[PDB]
Each structure stands twice: as structure tokens, then as C-alpha cells.
């Protein structure tokens, strides 16, 4: 789901 991707990214940037 294209609309989810930005979550994948915000979780990484936060992660590290």
C-alpha cells in the first residue's frame, strides 16, 4: 500500500 510507505520511512528516521 503506497499510502503506508511514509510510515516505513518516519519509523527508520526515528529508529536511527
Amino acid at each position, epitope marked *: *500500500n*503506497w*499510502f503506508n510507505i511514509t510510515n516505513x*520511512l*518516519w519509523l527508520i528516521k526515528k529508529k536511527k
Partner: antibody, heavy 127, light 109 residues
Framework: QVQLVQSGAEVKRPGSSVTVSCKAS????????LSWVRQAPGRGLEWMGG????????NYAPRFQGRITITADRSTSTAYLELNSLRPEDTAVYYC????????????????????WGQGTLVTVSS | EIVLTQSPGTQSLSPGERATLSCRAS???????LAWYQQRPGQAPRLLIY???SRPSGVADRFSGSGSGTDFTLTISRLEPEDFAVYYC?????????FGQGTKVEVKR
């Protein structure tokens, strides 16, 4: 803030190609989804596609595919909707929409839905 | 393609009253990714609800969204003058997002 500012109205011709721009200012640009949503004269909203500026991850709608391109200019925090093979039917108001983030306290965490909008751009396609 | 069916076409009722707008999808909307927008006459859409239940901050308590799977409902509890506008439902549970044809909330006289 997070302000989206679109280009002035346009009068193109059947067969022509139009390019509309959207300027984001007051929030992160490269990491949030940016979609374009038009509205024909006296009708509802139609979602055309989007793009995640980072890797230029594009999502096009079948009805438009192979006829539309959506771009991001990270160095200028701007988005571009280009649409060719313009027909009078495409006469509509084109909107720039940026998704919202959890708790405006502030920018951080995507939610999919479009919390931010441009003022809209009138594109008229007639001969 | 998922079709969002909004009804009634036009719901006409007095201010201070409660409005319940219906949105039914032709398929199951995954993760309840459903949003309700309010478009006032000469303006742009204003996001009211997302994730079916979730309300942004800035949106007044009047607005509440419920339902799931394939049946969603927007609810204004006590209509204010500004609430008489058009309302659209959008699904983003899959890549190809779609809107409902919209519903007008008119003042009844």
C-alpha cells in the same frame, strides 16, 4: 505552518500539455507523501496520483497512467503535476494535497489522509 | 477499483440537529483507512476524519467517525451554520485511492 501554494490558473488547448506546481513551506518535504486531486466543474473529487519526494516513489491512477507525471524538487521543496493529451473533460480545479502527521506538536508521523491543501489551480482546456 | 457509495445524496435538516452521513464501499477497506473531508462552497476540502475513527487536532468535537470493514458513518452532533456544506469520503486502504461522489448537507426550511 505547512503552507502549500499552487501556480496561477491556466488556459491550455486540446492536445496540449500542462504543468502545475505546488510549493510547500513550513514542514518537512522529502519524507511526506504529496498527492494531486482534481475536481471537475460541478462534480466531486478525483484522486490522480501522488509521490514521495525522497526516492521519487510515484503512485499513478490507471485512468491517467501513461499520460501523467508527478515530480518533486527536494532542493526547492516543490511538486509538479504534468498532464498531456489534454481534453475539454480535463477542465477542472487541480489541488495539491499533503498528508497530515500525528499530533501537530508538530511535524512527525504520516497518516495517509490529506490534512493540507493548496488554494487550487483552475485549468481550462478548450479550443 | 473500489467504489465508495455515499448517501443520502442530499440530507436536509435544521441547525443544532445531528447529521449522520453514510459511506459504503464496494469492497472491504483495509485497516479502516477512511477519511471524511468537508468542502465549503468556494473553498478547498478540509480534512475532518481519518482511519475511520481518528479526528485531527483542530477539528471540533462535533465530528465523529465510526464503522469499519465496509460500512462507515460520519456524525455531526450539533450542526453549526458552517457545517452546511459538502462532505466527501475517501479510501486509502490500497494504492488506488478513491472518493465518494459526495453528499450535500442542506438547511431545511
Amino acid at each position: 505552518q505547512v503552507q502549500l501554494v499552487q501556480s496561477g490558473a491556466e488556459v491550455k488547448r486540446p492536445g496540449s500539455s500542462v504543468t502545475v506546481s505546488c510549493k510547500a513551506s513550513g514542514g518537512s518535504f522529502s519524507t511526506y507523501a504529496l498527492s494531486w486531486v482534481r475536481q471537475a466543474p460541478g462534480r466531486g473529487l478525483e484522486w490522480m496520483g501522488g509521490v514521495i519526494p525522497l526516492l521519487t516513489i510515484t503512485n499513478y491512477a490507471p485512468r491517467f497512467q501513461g499520460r501523467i507525471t508527478i515530480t518533486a524538487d527536494r532542493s526547492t521543496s516543490t511538486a509538479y503535476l504534468e498532464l498531456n493529451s489534454l481534453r475539454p473533460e480535463d477542465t477542472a480545479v487541480y489541488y495539491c494535497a499533503r498528508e497530515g502527521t500525528t499530533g501537530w506538536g508538530w511535524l512527525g508521523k504520516p497518516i495517509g489522509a490529506f490534512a493540507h491543501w493548496g488554494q487550487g489551480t483552475l485549468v481550462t482546456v478548450s479550443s | 477499483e473500489i467504489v465508495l457509495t455515499q448517501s443520502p445524496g442530499t440530507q436536509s435538516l435544521s441547525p443544532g440537529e445531528r447529521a449522520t452521513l453514510s459511506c459504503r464501499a464496494s469492497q472491504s477497506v483495509g485497516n479502516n483507512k477512511l477519511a471524511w473531508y468537508q468542502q465549503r462552497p468556494g473553498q478547498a476540502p478540509r480534512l475532518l476524519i481519518y482511519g475511520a475513527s481518528s479526528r485531527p487536532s483542530g477539528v471540533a468535537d462535533r465530528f465523529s467517525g465510526s464503522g469499519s470493514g465496509t460500512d462507515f458513518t460520519l456524525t455531526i452532533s450539533r450542526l453549526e451554520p458552517e457545517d452546511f456544506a459538502v462532505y466527501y469520503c475517501q479510501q486509502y486502504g490500497q494504492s488506488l485511492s478513491t472518493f465518494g461522489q459526495g453528499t450535500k448537507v442542506e438547511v431545511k426550511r
